[PDB]
Subunit: 134 residues, 3 copies
């Protein structure tokens, strides 16, 4: 499916770096580091990296998952400190990336570097029914 | 969407700590540690933490993902040892959280502390079709 | 739901080891290591492990998530170096598993060992709408 997704550009430099689907078959949008200067990430360290963007999914039938990038993660050990992020339909603040160096090699994160992937999935809100036995 | 979700309270202390959606726009349910006493997690260690709860999704068109919490993960390095848990529609045992300290700071997990997020997503069962070329 | 999923067997040894849903209620398919010989993974190391298989989801309304296995991850610290893999509907290359030993114990990965889980989920492609305020 498609969905109209409201996007606020919090940092004007990101007008030139908006997330884009690579192909019509792509599942994810790439989120980039909105940084004034490169950030060095030592092995084991975590940085909170702004994206310069906010979204409003709005429809409670959907959420977004934020995932590491395959190359950064596999090749450089640059992943997410919370592993996978969950963006609620009513979350309207800046998207921030918990960036964790899970490997053994110091890495320099560049301004505007693609850092994570955003995937929009349907979700269900359960209504619990307490039972003694299933 | 909404779904009727059968829930068994395996440990009576959890009647006062049932998972709840924070808002009508929330995607996830918070799962809590069902513990008699605090558990200290040294850097690198993994503990299997009970929730005191079991669910039965029942509908094979759905599954649950269990994710780290953003604050615990980012700020304290308390995440999941299997990274992301997948709960099958027919899994009816106690939900257990593989809790891993991925950081460098010893952490004390409290009884009833929110430890993970549960998100219900639709899933598809594929029927493979072996081909020589796509 | 169900979906016809084209599958190319890139390595003939995998004809005897095709992924299979354990039960009609299972959400995930197990992906196995297609290896000539066991691979030793020291703590902290990452290996790129072939599956001997390629899929073509084809429908841009779906994607696959590749997750660690719960037992391997929890008990042995054998997880994914990119944490969670995202397979796009138009990705038709060999499925490769970034295999990372996140724990403190050396592990030997066996030929044909189940290494990851593949889950097919619906996804949405957003059309951004830039707004000044939500």
């Amino acid at each position: 499916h498609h969905m109209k997704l409201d996007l606020k550009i919090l940092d004007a430099r990101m007008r030139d770096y908006l997330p884009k689907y690579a192909t019509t078959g792509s599942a994810g949008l790439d989120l980039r580091a909105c940084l004034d200067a490169p950030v060095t990430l030592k092995p084991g360290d975590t940085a909170l990296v702004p994206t310069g963007l906010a979204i409003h999914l709005a429809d409670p039938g959907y959420a977004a998952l934020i995932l590491p990038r395959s190359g950064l993660g596999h090749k450089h050990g640059i992943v997410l400190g919370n592993l996978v992020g969950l963006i609620d339909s009513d979350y309207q603040g800046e998207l921030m990336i918990s960036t964790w160096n899970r490997g053994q090699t110091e890495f320099v994160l560049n301004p505007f570097e693609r850092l994570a992937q955003l995937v929009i999935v349907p979700v269900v809100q359960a209504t619990f029914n307490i039972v003694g036995d299933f």
